[PDB]
Amino acid sequence: GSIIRKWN
Amino acid sequence: NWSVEDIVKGINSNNLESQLQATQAARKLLSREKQPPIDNIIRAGLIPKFVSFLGKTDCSPIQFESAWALTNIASGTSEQTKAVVDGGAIPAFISLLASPHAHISEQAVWALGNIAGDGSAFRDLVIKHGAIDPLLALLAVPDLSTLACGYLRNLTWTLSNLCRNKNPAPPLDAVEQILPTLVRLLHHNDPEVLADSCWAISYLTDGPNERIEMVVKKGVVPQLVKLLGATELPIVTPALRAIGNIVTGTDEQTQKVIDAGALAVFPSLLTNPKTNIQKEATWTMSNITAGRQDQIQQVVNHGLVPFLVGVLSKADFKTQKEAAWAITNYTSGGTVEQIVYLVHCGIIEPLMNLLSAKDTKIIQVILDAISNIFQAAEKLGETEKLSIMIEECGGLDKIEALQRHENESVYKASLNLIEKYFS
Numbered sequence: 001g002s003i004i005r006k007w008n
Numbered sequence: 009n010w011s012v013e014d015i016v017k018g019i020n021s022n023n024l025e026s027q028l029q030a031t032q033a034a035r036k037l038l039s040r041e042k043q044p045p046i047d048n049i050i051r052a053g054l055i056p057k058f059v060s061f062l063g064k065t066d067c068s069p070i071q072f073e074s075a076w077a078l079t080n081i082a083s084g085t086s087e088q089t090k091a092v093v094d095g096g097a098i099p100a101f102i103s104l105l106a107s108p109h110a111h112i113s114e115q116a117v118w119a120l121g122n123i124a125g126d127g128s129a130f131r132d133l134v135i136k137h138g139a140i141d142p143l144l145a146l147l148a149v150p151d152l153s154t155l156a157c158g159y160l161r162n163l164t165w166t167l168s169n170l171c172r173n174k175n176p177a178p179p180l181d182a183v184e185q186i187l188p189t190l191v192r193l194l195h196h197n198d199p200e201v202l203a204d205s206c207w208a209i210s211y212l213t214d215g216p217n218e219r220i221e222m223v224v225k226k227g228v229v230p231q232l233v234k235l236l237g238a239t240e241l242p243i244v245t246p247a248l249r250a251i252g253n254i255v256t257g258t259d260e261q262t263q264k265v266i267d268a269g270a271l272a273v274f275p276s277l278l279t280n281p282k283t284n285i286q287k288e289a290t291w292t293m294s295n296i297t298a299g300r301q302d303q304i305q306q307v308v309n310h311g312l313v314p315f316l317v318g319v320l321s322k323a324d325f326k327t328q329k330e331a332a333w334a335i336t337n338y339t340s341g342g343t344v345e346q347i348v349y350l351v352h353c354g355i356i357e358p359l360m361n362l363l364s365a366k367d368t369k370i371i372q373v374i375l376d377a378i379s380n381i382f383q384a385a386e387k388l389g390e391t392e393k394l395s396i397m398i399e400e401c402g403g404l405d406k407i408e409a410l411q412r413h414e415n416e417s418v419y420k421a422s423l424n425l426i427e428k429y430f431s
Contacts, residue, residue: 001336001339001340001341001376001380002297002298002337002341003298003340004256004295004298005256005294005333006214006256008214008252008288
């Protein structure tokens with residue numbers, strides 16, 4: 001953290 | 009209902025009318041509900057013939073029939089679409105876009121939409137043949153409302169396919185060129201038009217922050233937020249996706265989502281009966297709790313912490329996994345005061361309960377959240393008090409049993425915790 005996660 | 013054999017006889021007579029009639033037969037065949045004989049038609053070598061009829065400006069009816077037949081082939085598998093492309097269909101459909109017969113122009117639109125949607129290479133190949141000008145030109149009217157529904161919906165869906173796919177994303181200059189029209193469609197009153205625009209916007213915002221930026225610069229965020237609270241699932245679904253993508257960018261980009269009122273829709277989104285809405289809403293929230301403390305504070309002000317607690321307590325496991333992520337991010341960037349608020353809202357019990365999940369990641373994520381909360385407790389001296397809640401809520405045993413765990417990071421942090429805080 002602090003962690004951005006994309007996708008989708 | 010002709011045989012393939014007869015359609016080929018028809019098409020190979022050099023008689024315009026027998027040709028027209030055979031093609032019409034072919035088109036009805038390929039529109040058949042059960043298992044239309046696409047491969048049969050393809051194997052008979054009919055495609056080049058069809059592509060050729062597309063150019064007969066004189067019999068517009070055979071232009072139409074052959075367009076429709078081709079469209080139904082290209083609407084099939086990726087190999088079937090390839091056959092239409094190999095047949096030379098792309099430039100031929102692009103010329104048709106300018107047909108004076110709306111029904112023919114429309115067919116060409118549909119065809120290019122199916123070809124572009126196969127994947128990024130066909131998408132780009134279609135762009136290279138110059139499909140975009142003629143497409144956008146079909147929408148160059150002061151008010152979209154004067155266009156026929158079916159027509160508009162087809163145009164929107166096709167443009168959406170030209171925005172679709174990654175590896176690579178569409179050419180930037182193509183995206184620049186399309187955006188203003190796509191933004192008009194996003195503001196149209198038709199539910200299907202709206203859904204396909206949102207899909208397009210969600211395609212375009214799935215990527216580097218530069219991509220996100222060109223979209224957000226168009227001022228679409230407020231309209232996205234509005235669509236976020238629509239009653240139609242087919243609209244909400246893509247709208248949530250676009251919002252979710254945007255908050256994966258810079259904090260300033262995320263701030264525009266917050267500024268537009270997005271957070272007020274989350275009480276219901278985080279409790280939405282449709283599992284994927286809930287899942288993606290929690291995902292979105294995780295990339296908001298990953299932001300600045302002032303942004304976390306806005307999550308707090310909007311009353312969303314009790315909702316995160318809720319989702320963490322009872323939800324599809326995937327959703328719960330997103331919720332664990334949102335708490336870890338929250339405990340990371342949050343102030344001590346905010347972290348304290350999180351505990352008071354009841355985060356501990358449902359956290360401890362998920363340490364029983366046979367999923368290595370969620371365990372790593374939760375234990376991470378536990379450290380961050382402990383370190384907050386340290387700055388208050390209140391480390392002991394917390395230590396108790398976690399035993400009282402049944403966690404101590406699980407953090408213990410997790411010393412023996414197969415993963416390294418897991419038993420590493422499991423042990424780290426027990427020493428600092430439980431002995």
